[PDB]
Amino acid sequence: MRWYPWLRPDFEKLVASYQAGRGHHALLIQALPGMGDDALIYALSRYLLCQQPQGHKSCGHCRGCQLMQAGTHPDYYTLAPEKGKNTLGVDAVREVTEKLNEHARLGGAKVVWVTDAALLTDAAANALLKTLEEPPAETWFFLATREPERLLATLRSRCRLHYLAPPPEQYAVTWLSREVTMSQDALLAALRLSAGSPGAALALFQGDNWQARETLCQALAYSVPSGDWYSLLAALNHEQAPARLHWLATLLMDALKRHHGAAQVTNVDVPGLVAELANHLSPSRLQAILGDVCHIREQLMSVTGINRELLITDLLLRIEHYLQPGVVLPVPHL
Amino acid sequence: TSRRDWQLQQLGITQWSLRRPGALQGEIAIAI
Amino acid sequence: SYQVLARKWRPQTFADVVGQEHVLTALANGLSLGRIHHAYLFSGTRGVGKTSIARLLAKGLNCETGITATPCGVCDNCREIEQGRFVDLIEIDAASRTKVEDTRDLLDNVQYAPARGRFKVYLIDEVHMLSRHSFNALLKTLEEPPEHVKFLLATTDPQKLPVTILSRCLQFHLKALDVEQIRHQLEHILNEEHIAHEPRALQLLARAAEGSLRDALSLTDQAIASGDGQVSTQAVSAMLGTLDDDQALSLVEAMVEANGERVMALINEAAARGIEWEALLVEMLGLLHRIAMVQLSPAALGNDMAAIELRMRELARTIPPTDIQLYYQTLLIGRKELPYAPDRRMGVEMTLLRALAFHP
Amino acid sequence: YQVLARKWRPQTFADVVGQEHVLTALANGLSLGRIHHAYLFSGTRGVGKTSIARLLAKGLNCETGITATPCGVCDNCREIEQGRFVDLIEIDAASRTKVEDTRDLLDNVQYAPARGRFKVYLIDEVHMLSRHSFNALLKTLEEPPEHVKFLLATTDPQKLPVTILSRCLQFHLKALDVEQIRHQLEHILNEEHIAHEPRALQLLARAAEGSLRDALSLTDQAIASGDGQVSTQAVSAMLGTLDDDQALSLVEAMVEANGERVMALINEAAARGIEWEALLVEMLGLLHRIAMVQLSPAALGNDMAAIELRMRELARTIPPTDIQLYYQTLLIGRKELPYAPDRRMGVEMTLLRALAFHPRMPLPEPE
Amino acid sequence: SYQVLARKWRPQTFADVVGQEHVLTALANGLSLGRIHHAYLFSGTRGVGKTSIARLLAKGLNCETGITATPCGVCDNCREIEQGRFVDLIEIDAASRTKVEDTRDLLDNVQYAPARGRFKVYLIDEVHMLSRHSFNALLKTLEEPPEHVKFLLATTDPQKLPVTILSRCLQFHLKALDVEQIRHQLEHILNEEHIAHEPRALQLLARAAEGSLRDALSLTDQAIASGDGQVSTQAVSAMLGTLDDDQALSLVEAMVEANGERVMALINEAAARGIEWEALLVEMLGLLHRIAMVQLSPAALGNDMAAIELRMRELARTIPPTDIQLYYQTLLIGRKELPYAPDRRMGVEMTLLRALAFHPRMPL
Amino acid sequence: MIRLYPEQLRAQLNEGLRAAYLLLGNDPLLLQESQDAVRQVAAAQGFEEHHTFSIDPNTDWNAIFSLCQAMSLFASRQTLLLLLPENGPNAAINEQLLTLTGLLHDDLLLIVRGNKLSKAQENAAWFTALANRSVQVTCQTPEQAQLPRWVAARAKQLNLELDDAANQVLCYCYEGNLLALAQALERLSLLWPDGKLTLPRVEQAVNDAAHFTPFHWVDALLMGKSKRALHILQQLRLEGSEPVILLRTLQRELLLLVNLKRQSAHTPLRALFDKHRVWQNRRGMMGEALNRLSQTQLRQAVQLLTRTELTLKQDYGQSVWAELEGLSLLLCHKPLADVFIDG
């Protein structure tokens, strides 16, 4: 939970409202992963639960600060999925709602934090509406999500939206170069792959994901000339399949844009691969493959219990079939 | 193929043609 | 402590509601004529006043003066109902009480007489979330309730209710509020709150509301919070990311000319400036619709757009209507799938690349 | 004051609307003396399963004797009407679905009736019973005591076990047609001394599908809206149905391929503020009706007689392919309506698309 | 009154049982030779005579004359068993009594000698509804059974019983009664009851029975009620039409032969009763898929569709595969477009019209 | 620990009586016969007391321990029988069984019934504790290849004459269910005292009660027998098997076949089988499969399987069995015009 510099302005705004008492009881933060929205929410929660606030920061010595540091504050609630599960059920929401009715142990504000509103099931989202509309006095809700459009409309209408804008590209590149050592092209490509959000690129670099991306690029470079797309299975069949599918889609989009003629491409560190993709494939086939890859990624991320290997194998065989002449290509439709 | 047919295909509109016109019982007057 | 505009300005009288004239007239006529049903259902979109009207009806039924369509608002029953602590008004949150056991327990107590009021009113909210067993258990008592109980149901998805339940109650459908009504309500609220505002900001907020008054109030609260306590045109435009300049016209012209480099450059510039992609797509759709409209009749072009008439007429004359329809369909498809793409910019680029292929 | 649905429950076999076969079978069985011990009633909602069951109970337990025409005036008939008859045990299976309740009920079946000659168990919503409850009734239902009768009513018969079905006589009630519903509404309104008009009653009957409870609820709502009267304008406003003349004129203008008339009609509708999705639905319905008329001359119903001739004209002129093309175009337009910038904009774009691809007179091609 | 046909005509002798020769002959031979097992189980469909045969066997075991396959029917034991007052015959409705405590008291009576019978017979029916503890108690009782007690079990779901219970009893499976035997039994019953009837009505009732005699008797009672003391072809046909619920196959047959009037009549009949249009489309799609599979291989059709086997076979043999594929695709498109149609009924009608008269145009 | 088959159990019992007997298998008939033989021998030896318990999470081990510890005034030589769960013993059951084996006496005869144990189950403290003083009888249902010999022997020991057609009918109707087949033989003997069992005689008193597993269906698909595959699928549907299990079992073999077909263009099949760890017996059938399905096929099958999986998972459809039948016919050499494949 690092505190990034670009969170300084936004915080200074939000807390200001809470100083004047003009604070909405339901705040929804829209931010890409790695933007540090969790740190902002934690800072706001610490400010709200401090018994002796000074300025815009908690004192750090009152009983509330000590309990927050120990992580055993009675009036602080967190709604997150179980360790083995992936969605947030309705039982937890109901228990939190029933617990919110009684008075606070320390006689102060009560803070409830939802780690990710996109993981709420339909039943949980519907159950939360009544509590969110008319919460008891001195109760604050914090929600974070990537795409507000994915949330329930009724739930969305009850919240105040705050959007975090990623910093400018040059500042992000300078910050990344300061944090880690790498070539400028690699840093720029990592930043663009993460939709311009710093920290996500740092997450890519610090881990072994870069080696996986290099392996995928080599496999695709081998496959494109020969035409054996089945060999990519080993490079895609993994628990992190959506990210690799996104990388492949980005490569296809870069190749298509290069064919059409453009000055900016997401993958700036691999001109040869995109050049080969543009040379060896026609625009219609590129569009069809891109659409199929996006659809399969969405199916993998959405459907629960779906088999990864079967879907990837079917996708690769379908792409190989599409590469054959005289095959009707899919057309988007409602 | 015809330009209009291709445009209708892109728009997602399917075109239906008579296959057993004797089934219809009425003064369809399709031919003019 | 502090209450948001949505909670503060909940209507407390039949004359304080906006729109929904037919429902109010029907309820008033029913109350006046003495024909009172035992099962009312309210359907409509979100934030249209289903719960408000249900609470107003409940208050009118149990008023001390009598069964009237104009509650006094000063007797003990009215005040207690307004405060939400009235004994004979039982409000159930069906979204968290879906269990059939709770429904059976509730039904087992209908035989008891009301404590203070002349009727025992049950207000079930989000009734569409109940289980099948709950609906089946309700059916029998809902058909023939005792003489001293009433049922009020509010839902936003009436399709999910079984036909048997729908057959047993009088249904009232609430229309989505018009832009003018929302604008007038916002202006009245701001005037009562002593907050400076401008007509264009109100127009933009009403347009962005999309027929929901709760959404309009939430947007107004956000604008007030983010605009140092003042509602101004620039603040609202920045919040909503209004296109303002004719970027959409240039983008659609580049798309029609099938010049990929120009389209990509414009998209890159827009991304650098950080605009909202949904607004861009909506503006492009509007421009395409206007161009199609002008082709049918030259006079169809609006007078408010008397700044780009030459380019619009050039596009209308040069492009056949079928290509306009194809572009409109492509942009609609792109708008539909935008939230499901890995990134908004990626989805917009995919849509534009697909559209660029419709050129011989 | 009292709700029409509860006030006008049939109390004699002559008051039942339709269901001729079931009534005839029951009357013949009662007259001949061949009475079973397990009856099942099936049908859609609000067709009179419970009413017929209660009438059968009255006939069985009437003081005069076992007759198909209950007097309706003796103590037993009045108590059954008021729901206070001891020997008519009415069970709400939707509420008591547990096997313990079924066992408790079965433990007291051998005791003689208190006052009547038969003990009648009327189980409603029997399809909600648990599997154990269903299996616990097999032997008692197969061989009940002499003075015990079972009456079952449900709207979802296929969920019952086949073993249960094999043990009872099945009667399937059928949905009522428009004529019967309209006649019943006319009779009820005449008895209630409420003014009405034929067109309003026809609209209410058509909007109620084949359920009388829905028709009565709509009648109550219309009376409330009309302030003590049932008027065609009030019912039309309540149902949100536009005049068929405007929709037919729009369809004719679209067929003729004259954009000016279509735009004028759209502007006129916008002046009133006609719902646009309803307009699309009405146009689709008119096109479907024209296609059906092309298929069979007798497809057209009586309610459209006012425009029938006009419809026939289209059926004599428009080829089926053009009708199919228009229907598909409007269906796609409705499909894409939610994502358009505005409903008016979406409908206008759909109509412009239909005009552009007109089979005979497309819009002029640019030079 | 006249009683009920099902109750009045209980088989009181082995000769009165219709069919089931492979079971009755084996039981008679076992009784004659003295080869009697400890536990018997009876399985089959509904209304095939499991309980009747169990009661007949119980009567035969404890007859005064001796262990014989032809009970006299006149001694006191036979009359008491027929009337259900025999002390040594204990009939247990396992469905009503499932808890272990209820079963324990009944099973603890095996420690007392019979009062007035050679054997102490337990007839447990609906035995598949017992709980695990009840099954354990029954197994413990069956492990060491006294020589003077017999257990008779009847159920329609033998797979629900534990394998341990199954392995310790001899199982007899009853078959369907077939059309001819049902018709003969109905004719005999009506002749005994002095009720006018016609051959066509009896054939229709037997065909609608679907292998169950109790269903046949119930339908006969309903027809007699409808016909006002008489069984006639027109009355039975009308009654069956009222209960007819196979509009999908009739619609498929009408559509395949291009008969619009029949299609409209079937649609009206389906709309007369409460039906789900999407369910009807799904049923039609399933029927078309089954016909295509049968065309691919005759073994595709199984015993689950024995009722409509002939019609499906005829459709598979007559219709070319291409027409079946075209209809299947048209119905798929119709199901896809149904939600956005002006009405469900209108959508179904439009799809049926397109299948009848129109042919889609495919790209390229 | 001694290892035996049901036929040698009586000979071993005649040789002597051990302390513990383990009966592991999936055939109820053989398990019951072995249990009856063991109990009869024990009763002959002087074991007139028997106890039976069911192993489950809600089990009273205190009663079993008290029975083991306590003595008897006159009724000594106790026999204890345990019924293991279908899934098999777990860690708690493992330690309970170890404790029980610790409290073992010469006058207590232990018998255990359950399904075949795996290597993990086999490698347990209680299992190894009984290794030196135990005999395990394996009771596995014979396959279709060895079934007719078993039927002929069983008929022979009952003094009956079976024709070849009657034997084939009995094997077909009661495959995988030996209890039903034995009861059918007993009923046939009762019906005909002379013992002459001809084809028309047996055909009258036989019903279809076969039992199968998904592996049988997959093997039938590999061989290419449409009738057998359809019959097995119908039986599985009647039983109530989970479609997902069938989908996974078919998926494994289908993906293996796809990979082998792709990589067999320039490699001998024997090397591929060795590299993929294919069992020697199966290598036959797999081979003919690769000689019956082309590369154009095995892609339509994969597409149909993926579509069926998606329909089952997200759409919650009820037409899974129809798609399974279509895929079964597709794997066999049939046209399968592809309108149903959505290809």
Ligand SMILES: Nc1ncnc2c1ncn2[C@@H]1O[C@H](COP(=O)(O)OP(=O)(O)O)[C@@H](O)[C@H]1O
């Ligand atoms: N018809 C109306 N007139 C005035 N205010 C309204 C109306 N409908 C909604 N509102 C405003 O929206 C807020 C929420 O409305 P609500 O009662 O939740 O409607 P719904 O139950 O349809 O969501 C209220 O606090 C009220 O201020």
Ligand SMILES: Nc1ncnc2c1ncn2[C@@H]1O[C@H](COP(=O)(O)OP(=O)(O)O)[C@@H](O)[C@H]1O
């Ligand atoms: N056949 C009929 N004749 C007269 N009224 C009917 C008929 N069917 C339904 N109704 C009206 O509908 C109301 C509800 O019917 P109900 O008893 O609920 O039928 P069901 O049990 O099938 O729902 C009744 O009060 C009655 O007035």
Ligand SMILES: Nc1ncnc2c1ncn2[C@@H]1O[C@H](COP(=O)(O)OP(=O)(O)O)[C@@H](O)[C@H]1O
């Ligand atoms: N084989 C048969 N012969 C004559 N009548 C039969 C036969 N099977 C069933 N029935 C008739 O069906 C009725 C019910 O049979 P039942 O004993 O319930 O069989 P099950 O126990 O299989 O349901 C009996 O009254 C009997 O008249």
Ligand code: ALF
């Ligand atoms: F949309 Al609501 F209560 F918030 F009906």
Ligand code: ALF
């Ligand atoms: F009471 Al009903 F269908 F609503 F029988």
Ligand code: ALF
């Ligand atoms: F009594 Al049954 F099948 F209904 F044996």
Ligand SMILES: [Mg+2]
């Ligand atoms: Mg509400």
Ligand SMILES: [Mg+2]
């Ligand atoms: Mg009813």
Ligand SMILES: [Mg+2]
């Ligand atoms: Mg029985």
Ligand SMILES: [Zn+2]
């Ligand atoms: Zn502090």
Ligand SMILES: [Zn+2]
């Ligand atoms: Zn008041």
Ligand SMILES: [Zn+2]
């Ligand atoms: Zn009377």
Ligand SMILES: [Zn+2]
């Ligand atoms: Zn006798």
